[PDB]
Design a protein around this ligand. Structure first.
Ligand SMILES: [Zn+2]
Ligand SMILES: [Zn+2]
Ligand SMILES: [Zn+2]
Lengths: 378, 285, 116
RNA sequence: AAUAAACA
């Protein structure tokens, strides 16, 4: 058993510390005016001082192509992790497993901090707020819990009679939307736990929900090939649009924080950009996932780039304006990637398999050789 | 014949018997992906081997790889059509009616495998199947320069296509394979055929291995009965383009001292000086 | 030193008026919360506070002699029904479990108490 | 006290 009561030896820990990078940028940005003023991080291991976080190099977003492996983070009960979030302080990392546990993993140095028995069902959804206040979760059972920053259990309520698969949140603490496997998107009142409205007319089980950061748009994705992507209108309840995008089973749908770009993972080996103000045409598609693309996460301080999971555990990195992918791990993260979550500083990325593990991914260090088993197996 | 051989290998105990079970299972799972004639019979023997050792767990192990078999069984029926028309036994003859009609059935078989019946993004699985289509065609019509040329240009195309999508160590593997298919042309079957040299010369300029190129060009010059008048034009056209004007005139020095040389290199060289080095007097002299 | 030239000690700001009588703090939702990040309500120490259970700020009780070990990392499920203290005084910690039971400790910067 | 030590 594991209860913190038996003694273990003293150990130094694998540290990915952003503090020597963030301090460096503060010293920089005084005498830096742009990125065209920045001193170059020459490729050698001696230039470990000159790293700035990705806010320092807004230009050149290939900074945050996090292919350097850090740490497999596995539990002692070996359940496959589904959702992964960082605390918006960048302090820890709550992670959802099939037995309904929230293992809070550390941030600068990763250890473990506590276990929870949160859900009676496999966890399926996890989002924080725009302030750090409230965390939203959801599961296979239909129960949605509110969580604080100290992970207090708040009043829980059966939001759905069948398995929720997402929950995203309005630009406030007032409104959010959960889609489930009954096929509906139900938009919720935050405080009253009151069922505002049901967005029917969808056809089959909808497994993702997004909310547009300003305009109040609920975007969804579907297994139903007839009604795959629906925009919605949260105050009225009417179907605003319908976008026929994918041949089967749209997995995860994410909008930028700039408010224009729709991004859509799907089981036909594709990620697609849609400008949401022009649904007639189509922006670029993203080809390179040799099996199905099951997880997608936009980069926080770089609009333009995102990481894109695979059902073969393939972990790929893209960029808007760039047709083929940038980073690459194949046969490397083993299993089926369910979710990704960047650190708030966009410098270290997480993962999560259908195998029982959940690896962590920092940026490539200067002047190392990528002979690692993820990058070049030689 | 390897299925029955592994069963013929004597193993006593329980761990060595499970070593037999592991070895026979691996060839089963590999062979039931491969398109061929009797793929319906290998799976039939696969069903009886799983049920032959454990009936209960046979219902899962057959079911877990059955969907990939149904893709393998379907494309194998698609593979029958283009292969039933081919000969696969004719000697290699340079072109002189029926021969050009055979070439069309090869160009159909090349471009159909380029059409990717096994629809996938993995260019390594795409190319090596097209490379297997190339190697079968080079047995029957190896004295044709186009089948050698469309071979390695597909590898040059697959080199820059794998250079984009992350697979960097395999990008140079097909890139040196592109020089290899060009090497097999000039060394085995087509030694006096100039065209596959220059495709192999300009491929190595595109890989920026400029020291290797002079060995390629001078290999052709050592061959006795050719016309080096064309080669000295192109071997001057390399030196000006990659190494400068003075490197070009060293080639044109070697063009004057070869008996076999005709008048066309004297036309090219004055135009190489006038159009590139912008001089009229050297072009006049 | 900012307090010789632009001193503000004689100003009663509207900000200080906003935080004495708390200036309209809403009675917090979901009565199984923690009241975390909130300081104290002066309405409870002097007299009756007015609202019970569902109140924003913290209500303290006596006879707390040991500070809370979970609370330091930022994980307080109990809140004000906690049987342990929530200050930062480094004198009311528990005895370290591995120095009291299992001989010596392991780490070099153990905050917890080491008594012999 | 509710996983402080969750180790390779
Ligand atoms: Zn009070
Ligand atoms: Zn406490
Ligand atoms: Zn101690």
């Amino acid at each position: 058993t594991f209860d913190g009561k038996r003694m273990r030896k003293a150990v130094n820990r694998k540290t990915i510390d952003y503090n020597p990078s963030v301090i460096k940028y503060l010293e920089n940005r005084i005498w830096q005016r742009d990125q065209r003023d920045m001193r170059a991080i020459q490729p050698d291991a001696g230039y470990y001082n000159d790293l700035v976080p990705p806010i320092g190099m807004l230009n050149n977003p290939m900074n945050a192509v996090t292919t350097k492996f850090v740490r497999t983070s596995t539990n002692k009960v070996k359940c496959p992790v589904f959702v992964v979030r960082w605390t918006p302080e960048g302090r820890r990392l709550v992670t959802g497993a099939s037995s309904g546990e929230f293992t809070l993993w550390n941030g600068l140095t990763f250890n473990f901090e506590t276990i929870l028995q949160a859900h009676d069902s496999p966890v399926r959804a996890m989002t924080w707020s725009h302030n750090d206040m409230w965390m939203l979760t959801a599961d296979h059972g239909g129960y949605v819990k509110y969580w604080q920053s100290n992970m207090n259990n708040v009043k829980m309520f059966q939001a759905h009679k069948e398995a929720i698969r997402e929950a995203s949140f309005s630009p406030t603490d007032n409104k959010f939307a959960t889609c489930s496997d009954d096929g509906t998107v139900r938009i919720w009142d935050f405080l009253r736990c009151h069922e505002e409205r049901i967005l029917r007319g969808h056809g089959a089980d909808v497994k993702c929900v997004d909310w547009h950061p300003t305009k109040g748009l609920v975007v969804s994705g579907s297994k139903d090939s007839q009604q795959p992507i629906k925009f919605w209108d949260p105050k009225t309840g009417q179907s605003l649009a319908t976008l026929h995008a994918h041949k089967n089973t749209v997995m995860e749908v994410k909008l930028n924080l700039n408010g224009n770009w729709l991004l859509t993972a799907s089981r036909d080996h594709l990620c697609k950009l849609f400008d949401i103000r022009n649904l007639k045409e189509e922006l670029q598609v993203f080809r390179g996932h040799k099996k199905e693309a099951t997880a997608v996460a936009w980069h926080p301080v770089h609009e333009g780039l995102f990481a894109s999971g695979g059902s073969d555990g393939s972990l790929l990195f893209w960029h808007v304006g760039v047709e083929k992918e940038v980073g690459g791990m194949e046969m490397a993260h083993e299993g089926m990637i369910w979710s990704l979550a960047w650190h708030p500083l966009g410098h270290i990325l997480c993962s999560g398999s259908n195998d029982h593990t959940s690896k962590f991914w920092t940026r490539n260090r200067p002047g190392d050789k990528m002979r690692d088993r993820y990058n070049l197996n030689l | 014949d390897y299925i029955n051989f592994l069963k013929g290998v004597e193993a006593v105990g329980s761990y060595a018997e499970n070593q037999r079970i592991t070895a026979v299972r691996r060839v089963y799972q590999r062979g039931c992906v491969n398109p061929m004639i009797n793929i319906e019979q290998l799976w039939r023997d696969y069903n009886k081997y799983e049920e032959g050792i454990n009936i209960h767990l046979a219902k899962k192990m057959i079911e877990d790889r059955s969907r990939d078999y149904m893709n393998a069984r379907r494309v194998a029926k698609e593979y029958e059509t283009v292969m039933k028309g081919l000969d696969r036994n004719a000697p290699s003859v340079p072109p002189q009616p029926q021969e050009a009609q055979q070439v069309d059935m090869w160009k159909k078989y090349i471009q159909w495998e380029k059409s990717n019946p096994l629809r996938t993004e993995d260019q390594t699985l795409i190319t090596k199947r097209v490379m297997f289509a190339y190697e079968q065609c080079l047995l029957v019509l190896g004295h044709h320069p186009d089948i050698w040329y469309e071979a390695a240009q597909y590898l040059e195309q697959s080199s820059k296509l794998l250079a984009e999508k992350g697979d960097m160590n395999n990008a140079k593997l097909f890139s040196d394979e592109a020089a290899n298919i060009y090497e097999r042309a000039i060394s085995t079957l087509l030694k006096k055929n100039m065209l596959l040299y220059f495709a192999y010369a300009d491929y190595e300029e595109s890989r920026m291995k400029y020291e290797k190129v002079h060995s390629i060009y001078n290999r052709l010059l050592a061959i006795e009965d050719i016309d080096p008048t064309l080669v000295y034009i192109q071997y001057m056209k390399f030196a000006r383009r990659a190494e400068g004007i003075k490197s070009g005139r060293m080639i044109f020095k070697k063009a004057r001292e070869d008996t076999r040389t005709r008048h066309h290199v004297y036309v090219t060289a004055a135009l190489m000086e006038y159009y590139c080095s912008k001089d009229k007097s050297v072009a006049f002299k | 030193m900012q307090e010789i030239i632009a001193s503000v000690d004689h100003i009663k700001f509207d900000l200080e008026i906003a935080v004495e009588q708390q200036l309209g703090a809403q009675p917090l939702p979901f009565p199984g919360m923690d009241k975390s990040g909130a300081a104290v309500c002066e309405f409870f120490l002097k007299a009756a506070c007015g609202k019970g259970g569902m109140c924003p700020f913290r209500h303290i009780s006596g006879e707390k002699t040991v500070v809370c070990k979970h609370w330091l990392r930022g994980l307080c499920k109990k809140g004000d029904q906690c049987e342990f203290l929530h200050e930062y005084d480094m004198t009311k910690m528990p005895e370290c479990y591995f120095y009291s039971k299992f001989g010596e400790c392991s780490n070099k910067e153990c905050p917890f108490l080491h008594i012999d």
